[PDB]
Short mmCIF file of C-alpha atoms and ligand atoms in Angstrom, two decimals:
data_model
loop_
_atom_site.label_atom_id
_atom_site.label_comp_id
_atom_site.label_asym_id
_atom_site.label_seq_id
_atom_site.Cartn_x
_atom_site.Cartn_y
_atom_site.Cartn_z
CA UNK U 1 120.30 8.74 117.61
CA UNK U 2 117.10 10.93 118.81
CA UNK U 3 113.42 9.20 118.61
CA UNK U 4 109.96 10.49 119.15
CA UNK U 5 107.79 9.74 122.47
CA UNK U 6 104.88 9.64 120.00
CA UNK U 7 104.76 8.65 116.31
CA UNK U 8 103.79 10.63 113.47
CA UNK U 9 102.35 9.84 110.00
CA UNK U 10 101.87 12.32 107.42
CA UNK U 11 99.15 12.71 104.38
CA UNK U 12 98.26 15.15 102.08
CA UNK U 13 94.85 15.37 101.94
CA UNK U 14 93.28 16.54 98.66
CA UNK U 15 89.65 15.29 99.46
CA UNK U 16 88.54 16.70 102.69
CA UNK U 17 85.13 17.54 103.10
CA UNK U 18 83.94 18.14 106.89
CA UNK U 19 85.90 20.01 109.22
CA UNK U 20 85.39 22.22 112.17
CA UNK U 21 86.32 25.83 111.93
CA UNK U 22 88.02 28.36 114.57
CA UNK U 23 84.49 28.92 116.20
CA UNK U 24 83.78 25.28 116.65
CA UNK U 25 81.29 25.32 113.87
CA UNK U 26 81.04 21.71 111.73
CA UNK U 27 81.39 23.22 108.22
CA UNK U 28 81.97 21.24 104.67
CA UNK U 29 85.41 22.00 102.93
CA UNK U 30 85.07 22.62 98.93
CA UNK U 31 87.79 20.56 98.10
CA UNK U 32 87.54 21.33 94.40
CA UNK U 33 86.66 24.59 92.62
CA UNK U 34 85.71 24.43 88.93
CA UNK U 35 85.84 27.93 88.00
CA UNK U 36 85.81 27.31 84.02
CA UNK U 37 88.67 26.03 82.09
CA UNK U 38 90.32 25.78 85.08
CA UNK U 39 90.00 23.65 88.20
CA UNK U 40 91.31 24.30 91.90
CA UNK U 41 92.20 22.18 94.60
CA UNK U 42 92.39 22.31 98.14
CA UNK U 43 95.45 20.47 99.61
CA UNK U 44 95.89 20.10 103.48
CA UNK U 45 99.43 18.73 104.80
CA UNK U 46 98.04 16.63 108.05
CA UNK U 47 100.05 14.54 110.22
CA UNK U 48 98.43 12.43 113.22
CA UNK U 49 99.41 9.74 115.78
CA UNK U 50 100.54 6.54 114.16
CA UNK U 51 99.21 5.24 117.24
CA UNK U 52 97.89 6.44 120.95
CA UNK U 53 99.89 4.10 122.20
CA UNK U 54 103.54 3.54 120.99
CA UNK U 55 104.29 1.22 123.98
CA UNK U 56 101.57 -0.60 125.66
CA UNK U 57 102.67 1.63 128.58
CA UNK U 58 101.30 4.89 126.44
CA UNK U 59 103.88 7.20 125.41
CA UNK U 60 107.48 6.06 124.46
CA UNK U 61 110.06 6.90 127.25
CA UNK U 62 107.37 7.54 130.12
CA UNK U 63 108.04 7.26 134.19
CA UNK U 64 104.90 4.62 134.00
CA UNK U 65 105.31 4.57 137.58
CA UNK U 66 104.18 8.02 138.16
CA UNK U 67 102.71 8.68 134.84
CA UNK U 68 100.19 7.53 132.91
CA UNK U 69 100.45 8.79 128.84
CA UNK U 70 98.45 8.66 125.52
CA UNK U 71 99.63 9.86 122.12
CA UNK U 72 97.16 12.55 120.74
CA UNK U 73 97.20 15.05 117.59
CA UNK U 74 97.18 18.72 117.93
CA UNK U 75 96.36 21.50 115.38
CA UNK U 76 96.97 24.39 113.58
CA UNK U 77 94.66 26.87 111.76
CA UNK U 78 94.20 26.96 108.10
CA UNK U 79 92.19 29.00 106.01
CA UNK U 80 89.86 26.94 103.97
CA UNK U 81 87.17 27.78 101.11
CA UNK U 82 83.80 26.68 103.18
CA UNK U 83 80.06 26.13 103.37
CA UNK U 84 77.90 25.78 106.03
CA UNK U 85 74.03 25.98 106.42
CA UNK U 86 74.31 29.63 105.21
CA UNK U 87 76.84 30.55 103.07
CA UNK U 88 80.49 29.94 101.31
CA UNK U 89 83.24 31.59 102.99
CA UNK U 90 86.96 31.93 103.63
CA UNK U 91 86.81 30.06 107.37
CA UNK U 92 90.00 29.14 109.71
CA UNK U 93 89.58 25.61 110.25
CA UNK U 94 91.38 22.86 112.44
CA UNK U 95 94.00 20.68 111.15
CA UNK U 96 95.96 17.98 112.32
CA UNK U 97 99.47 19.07 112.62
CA UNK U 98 102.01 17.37 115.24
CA UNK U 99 101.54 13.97 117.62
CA UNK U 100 102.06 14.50 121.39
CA UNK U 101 101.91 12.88 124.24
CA UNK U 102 99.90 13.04 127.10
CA UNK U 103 100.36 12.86 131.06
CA UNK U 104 98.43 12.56 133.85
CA UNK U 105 98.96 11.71 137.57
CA UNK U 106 99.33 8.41 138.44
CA UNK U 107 97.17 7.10 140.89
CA UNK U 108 99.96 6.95 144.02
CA UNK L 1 93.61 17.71 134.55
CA UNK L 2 96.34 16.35 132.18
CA UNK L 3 99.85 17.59 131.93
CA UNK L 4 101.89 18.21 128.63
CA UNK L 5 105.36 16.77 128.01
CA UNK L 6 106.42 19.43 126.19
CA UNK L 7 105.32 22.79 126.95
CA UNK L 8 104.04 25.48 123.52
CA UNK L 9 103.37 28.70 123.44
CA UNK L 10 100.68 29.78 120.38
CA UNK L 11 100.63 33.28 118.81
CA UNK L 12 98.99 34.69 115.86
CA UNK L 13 101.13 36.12 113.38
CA UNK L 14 99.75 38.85 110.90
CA UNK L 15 102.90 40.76 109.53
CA UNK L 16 104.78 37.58 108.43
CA UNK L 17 107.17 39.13 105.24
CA UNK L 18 109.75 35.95 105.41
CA UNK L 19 109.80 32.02 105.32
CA UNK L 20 110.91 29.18 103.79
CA UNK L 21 108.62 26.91 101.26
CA UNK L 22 108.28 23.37 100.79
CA UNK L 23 111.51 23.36 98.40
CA UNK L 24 113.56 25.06 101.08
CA UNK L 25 113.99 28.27 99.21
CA UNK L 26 113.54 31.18 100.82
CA UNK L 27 110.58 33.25 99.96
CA UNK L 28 108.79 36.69 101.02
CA UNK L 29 105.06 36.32 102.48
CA UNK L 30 102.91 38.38 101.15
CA UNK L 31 100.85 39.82 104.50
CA UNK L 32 98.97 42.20 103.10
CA UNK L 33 96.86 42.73 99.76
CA UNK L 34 94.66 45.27 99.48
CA UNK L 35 92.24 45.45 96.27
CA UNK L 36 89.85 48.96 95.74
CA UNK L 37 91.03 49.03 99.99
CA UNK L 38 89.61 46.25 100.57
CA UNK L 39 92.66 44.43 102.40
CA UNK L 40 93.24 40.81 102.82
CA UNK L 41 95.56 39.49 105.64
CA UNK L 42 97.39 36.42 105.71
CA UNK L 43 97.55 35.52 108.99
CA UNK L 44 99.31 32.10 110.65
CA UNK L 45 98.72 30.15 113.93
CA UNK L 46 102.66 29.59 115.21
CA UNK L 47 103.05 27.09 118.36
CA UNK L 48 106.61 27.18 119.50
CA UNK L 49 108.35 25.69 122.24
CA UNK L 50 108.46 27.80 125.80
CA UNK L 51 111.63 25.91 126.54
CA UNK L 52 114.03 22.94 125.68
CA UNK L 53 113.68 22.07 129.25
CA UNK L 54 110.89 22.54 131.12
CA UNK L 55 111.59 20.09 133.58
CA UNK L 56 115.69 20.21 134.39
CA UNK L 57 116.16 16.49 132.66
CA UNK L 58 114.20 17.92 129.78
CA UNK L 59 111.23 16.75 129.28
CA UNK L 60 107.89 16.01 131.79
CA UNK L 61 106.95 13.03 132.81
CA UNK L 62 110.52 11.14 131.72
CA UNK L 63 111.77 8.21 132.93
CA UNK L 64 115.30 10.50 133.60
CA UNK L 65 117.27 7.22 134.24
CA UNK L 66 116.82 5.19 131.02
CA UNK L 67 116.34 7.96 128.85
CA UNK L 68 117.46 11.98 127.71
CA UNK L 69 115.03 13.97 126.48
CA UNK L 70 114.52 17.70 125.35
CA UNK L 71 111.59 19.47 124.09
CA UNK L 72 112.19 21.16 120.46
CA UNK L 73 109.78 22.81 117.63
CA UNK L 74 108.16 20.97 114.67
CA UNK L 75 106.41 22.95 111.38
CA UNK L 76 104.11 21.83 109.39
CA UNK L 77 103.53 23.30 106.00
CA UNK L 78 100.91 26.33 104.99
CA UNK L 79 99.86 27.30 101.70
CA UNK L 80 100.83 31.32 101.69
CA UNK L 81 100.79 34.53 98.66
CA UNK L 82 104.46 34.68 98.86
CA UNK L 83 107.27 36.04 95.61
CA UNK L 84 110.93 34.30 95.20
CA UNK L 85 111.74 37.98 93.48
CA UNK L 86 111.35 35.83 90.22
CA UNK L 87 107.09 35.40 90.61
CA UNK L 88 104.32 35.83 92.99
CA UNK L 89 102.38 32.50 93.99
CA UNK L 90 100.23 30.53 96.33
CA UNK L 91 103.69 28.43 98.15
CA UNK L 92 103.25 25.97 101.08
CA UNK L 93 105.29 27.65 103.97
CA UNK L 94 107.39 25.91 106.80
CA UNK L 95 105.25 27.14 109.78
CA UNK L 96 106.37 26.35 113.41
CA UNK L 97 103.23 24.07 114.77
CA UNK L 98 104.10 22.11 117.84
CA UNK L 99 106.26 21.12 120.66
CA UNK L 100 107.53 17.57 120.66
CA UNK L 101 109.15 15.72 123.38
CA UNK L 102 112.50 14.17 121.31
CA UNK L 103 113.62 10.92 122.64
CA UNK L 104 117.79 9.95 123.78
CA UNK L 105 118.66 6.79 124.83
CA UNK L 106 121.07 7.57 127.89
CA UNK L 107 124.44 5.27 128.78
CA UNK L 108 123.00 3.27 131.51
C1 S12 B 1 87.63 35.58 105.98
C2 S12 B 1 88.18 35.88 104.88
C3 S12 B 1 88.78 36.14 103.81
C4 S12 B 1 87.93 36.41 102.61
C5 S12 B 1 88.42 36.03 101.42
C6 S12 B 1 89.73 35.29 101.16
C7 S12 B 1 89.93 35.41 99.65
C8 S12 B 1 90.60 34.67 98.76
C9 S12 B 1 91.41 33.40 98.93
C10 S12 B 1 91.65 32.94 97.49
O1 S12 B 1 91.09 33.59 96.61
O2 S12 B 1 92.46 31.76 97.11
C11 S12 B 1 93.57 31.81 96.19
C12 S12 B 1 94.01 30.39 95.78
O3 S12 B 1 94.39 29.64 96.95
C13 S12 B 1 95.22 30.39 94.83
O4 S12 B 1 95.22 29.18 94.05
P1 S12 B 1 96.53 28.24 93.82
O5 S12 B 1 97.24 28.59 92.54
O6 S12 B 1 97.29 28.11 95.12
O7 S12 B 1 95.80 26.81 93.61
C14 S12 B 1 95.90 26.02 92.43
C15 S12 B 1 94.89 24.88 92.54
N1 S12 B 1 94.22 24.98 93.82
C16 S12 B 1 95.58 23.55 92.44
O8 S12 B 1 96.45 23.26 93.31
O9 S12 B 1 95.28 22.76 91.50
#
């Protein structure tokens, strides 16, 4: 009978078109690829917060009296067929992977 | 100067040869390919968990009374060259991506 402090939701995304890449650089993602007779796609697996707050409190299962808590997304690193200004390119790029939560000192 | 409930370590992995894909069969990665020696890697972004318990109740930041908690690893899923022995392909590959505070309601 586990649970989650924060709340995931998953989506595969098949139409992304801005991301940021490993070198904080806002690049466009060619999501599709029509290279003749044939057409590719770019699928990304994301999952982010269902909410920053589970509880109004912040995070599920908190100490709110020492604690105060959001629910954020984290990342991974994918390759990704980009553009930017310049040129097309291979790029690492950010992706939303997990939910987590988030402390902080409580003021007391 | 925010605190994490669930402590991750990150590493780059470049000579990845085994994994599972996205229909739980096991596959070999691919790390390497190398056309007229111009090589290719396949790198991943891996965030594990340091430990199931940072804090000795488990998790940071948990109200220890109401609640059990312990740290443990999520994936998330990575398109990667791999071969089942029976083709080479493009698979999506269970990656480790985060550390997740799991929730456990305690006998009170
Ligand atoms: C920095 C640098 C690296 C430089 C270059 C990296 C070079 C090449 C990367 C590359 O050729 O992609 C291969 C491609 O994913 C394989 O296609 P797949 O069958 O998975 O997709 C089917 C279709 N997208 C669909 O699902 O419909």
């Amino acid at each position: 009978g586990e649970f989650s402090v924060c709340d995931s939701v998953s989506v595969w995304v098949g139409d992304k078109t801005t991301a940021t890449d490993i070198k904080g650089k806002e690049v466009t993602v060619l999501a599709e690829v029509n290279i003749n007779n044939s057409v590719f796609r770019q699928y990304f697996f994301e999952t982010k917060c269902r909410a920053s707050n589970p509880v109004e409190s912040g995070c599920r299962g908190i100490d709110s009296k020492h604690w105060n808590s959001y629910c954020t997304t984290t990342h991974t690193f994918v390759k990704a067929l980009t553009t930017d200004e310049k040129q097309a390119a291979w790029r690492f790029i950010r992706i939303d992977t997990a939910c987590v939560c988030v402390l902080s000192r409580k003021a007391t």
